[PDB]
Structures are given as C-alpha cells and as structure tokens.
C-alpha cells in the first residue's frame, strides 16, 4: 500500500460524508491533498467553517507524517527512486539513470530541436517494466499545439517489441484551448489519477498559450500569477502521486540584455517564475543532420555537461557513428 490514501479514509474519523463530498468537489481526492493544503484554502470552500477545517486538518496530520527525520532515511528513499530511460544511452548517462520521478524536468530550445519526439519516446518508455528502465504505468499527454501523433508512439512500441494496441490504450490525451482549460485539465487529471496508476505526465507546451492570451506589459502580472498557480498545482500533483512531470518550453531571442552575442542568442521564456519552479532544466540544440545536443542548464545534483542523441524512425535514440 505505497500509494496515496483515498479521501474516503477521513469519513471514518469523525468527518461527515457531506464534508468529504464538498472537499471532493473542490478537487481534493486524497488525504495527502487535504493535509498539504493550507487552512485558508479549505476556508474558501463553501459550507466549511473554521472548526470543520481545523478538525479535518488535525485528522490529516494524524494520518500523514509531516515531522523531522534524519538524512539517512532520505538517502535510503532517494536510492530507491524510479528513473525512466529516454531511449538513448548517452542521455541516460548524462542524467545518471534517466528522468527522475517526483520532480519537474523541463526541456527548452528553439523549434525543430525535438522536444515532442522526446516526449513521445518518454510516453512509450514509461510503460516498460522496471528491469528495462520503465515505470510500469500509464501516461498522460496534455497538448497545447495540436502536435500529438500516435504514429511515433506506434513506431517506438514496435522498436521496443510491445504491442501497439496496449501502448495506445494506456495513453490518456487532452487538448488545451486556453489557460483556464489548461488548469481545469489538471483537476480532471487528479480525479482520474487517484483511481488508476500513472507514472508520467507531459505538458507540451506549458507556456505556448500564455504568449497570446496575456499580450502586453499591462497584463504581465496576471500572466505571471496564473503561471505560478499552474506550476504550483503541477508540483502538488507530483508530490501527491509520485508521477514524473515533464514540461516543454519555448525560447525568445535576446536583443539588448546580453551585450555579448553568439551567432544567435536565445533564452527561455516564462521568466523567473518558471526558472525557479522547475527542478531540472535541459537545453536542446541542433547538431549536424539528425543529431541533436542536450545540455544540463540547471540541476541540484547533476554537473553541467553535454550529450548527443538522434531522432530516427523509431523515436529518440543514439546517433549512428
């Protein structure tokens, strides 16, 4: 029973079923979500008073341990985390195992670098058994550009020997048409993820719709606040279910804030909010032909380095030397 505890545990603790239902309408489908929420978040729910919120929080804190623990236990738990291989030996060596679970990995770069190909390969590979480097679970794909193609999934599944029907049936797909729908898809995702087992969630791209929904300097603050809310909800999901959250980002050309330029200098968009929210950052660059280069922009433990991969008919793999 390593998974999260469903919210149907608080009912047999002194909380009426009506309050549990009201919490479920608020989007809290798990005792962990209730425990992690602050008091003022539960206050805003209609029909819940201060005493009820205090009782619910006390019960959740009783059920979920949130105390002080030594570093050896954290080391032991960190040595047993699941890392999903990206399909390339060099990329796995660069990431010291692959994409980490329970954190946010963001790949950014100019167009044509291959973020969507990496996302498709990861979506297929997350279904592999643990021995082969997978996570043994379903995958979700929130797509904000219309670039989702199951043909790449079928090709990578053929490469890995898995049946195409099984791979396709275990991938949930949603399309976001604006920012509010993008945020509501996360609530729906939590609702559908409390029941089944999911190992990987993909947002591609996180900041595509913000470049057009909130245009101009006068709408910068609201855009940044909404982006911060979205990223915080993603982090809440990652801490809740232990999934691997992978988001893709775009770039903007530096003009004057650098004063020292390469052939063409570009920097990621989203600003300090997305710079601080992300845990691991990868920078993707175009090489010669089908080869591409991945660099570790930001990582709390991975030293900065570069690796070379390629995009073949079977997805992301190693370059043919």
């Amino acid at each position: 029973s390593f998974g999260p505890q469903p919210i149907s545990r608080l009912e047999q603790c002194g909380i009426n079923a009506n309050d549990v239902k009201k919490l479920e309408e608020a989007g809290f489908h798990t005792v962990e979500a209730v425990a992690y929420a602050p008091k003022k978040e539960l206050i805003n729910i209609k029909g819940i008073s201060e005493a009820k919120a205090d009782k619910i929080l006390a019960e959740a804190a009783k059920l979920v341990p949130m105390g002080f623990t030594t570093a050896t236990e954290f080391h032991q738990r960190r040595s047993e985390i699941i890392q999903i291989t990206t399909g390339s030996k060099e990329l796995d060596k660069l990431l010291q195992g692959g994409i980490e679970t329970g954190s946010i990995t963001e790949m950014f770069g100019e167009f044509r670098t291959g973020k969507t190909q990496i996302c498709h390969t990861l979506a297929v590979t997350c279904q592999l058994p643990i021995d082969r480097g997978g996570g043994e679970g379903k995958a979700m794909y929130i797509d904000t550009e219309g670039t989702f193609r199951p043909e790449r999934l079928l090709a990578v599944a053929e490469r890995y020997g898995l049946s195409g029907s099984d791979v396709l049936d275990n991938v949930a797909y949603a399309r976001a048409f604006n920012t509010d729908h993008q945020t509501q898809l996360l609530y729906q995702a939590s609702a559908m993820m409390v029941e089944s087992r999911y190992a990987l969630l993909i947002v591609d791209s996180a900041t595509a719709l913000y470049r057009t929904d909130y245009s101009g300097r006068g709408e910068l603050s609201a855009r940044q606040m909404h982006l911060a809310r979205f990223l915080r909800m993603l982090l809440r999901l990652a801490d809740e279910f232990g999934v691997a959250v992978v988001i893709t980002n775009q770039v903007v050309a530096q003009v004057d804030g650098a004063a020292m330029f390469a052939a063409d200098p570009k920097k990621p968009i989203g600003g300090n909010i997305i710079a601080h929210a992300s845990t691991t950052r990868l920078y993707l660059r175009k090489g010669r032909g089908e080869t591409r280069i991945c660099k570790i922009y930001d990582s709390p433990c991975l030293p900065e380095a570069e690796a070379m991969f390629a995009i073949n008919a079977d997805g992301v793999g190693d370059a043919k030397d």
């Binding site: 390593f2 341990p65 623990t69 236990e73 954290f74 738990r77 960190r78 047993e80 985390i81 699941i82 980490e100 679970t101 329970g102 954190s103 279904q127 592999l128 058994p129 643990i130 996570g135 043994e136 679970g137 379903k138 020997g161 898995l162 049946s163 099984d166 791979v167 275990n170 087992r197 190992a199 232990g242 999934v243 691997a244």
Partner: peptide, 18 residues
Amino acid sequence: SLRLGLSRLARVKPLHPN
C-alpha cells in the same frame, strides 16, 4: 515514513505481460 516518488521495489502487476 517518507515518500519521494515511486519506489523501485514496490510490487505492482505487470502492465504489459507479453
């Protein structure tokens, strides 16, 4: 206890038996 991500030794049914 602690919980960071998905435990590698947690028993789970095979998604793709094959």
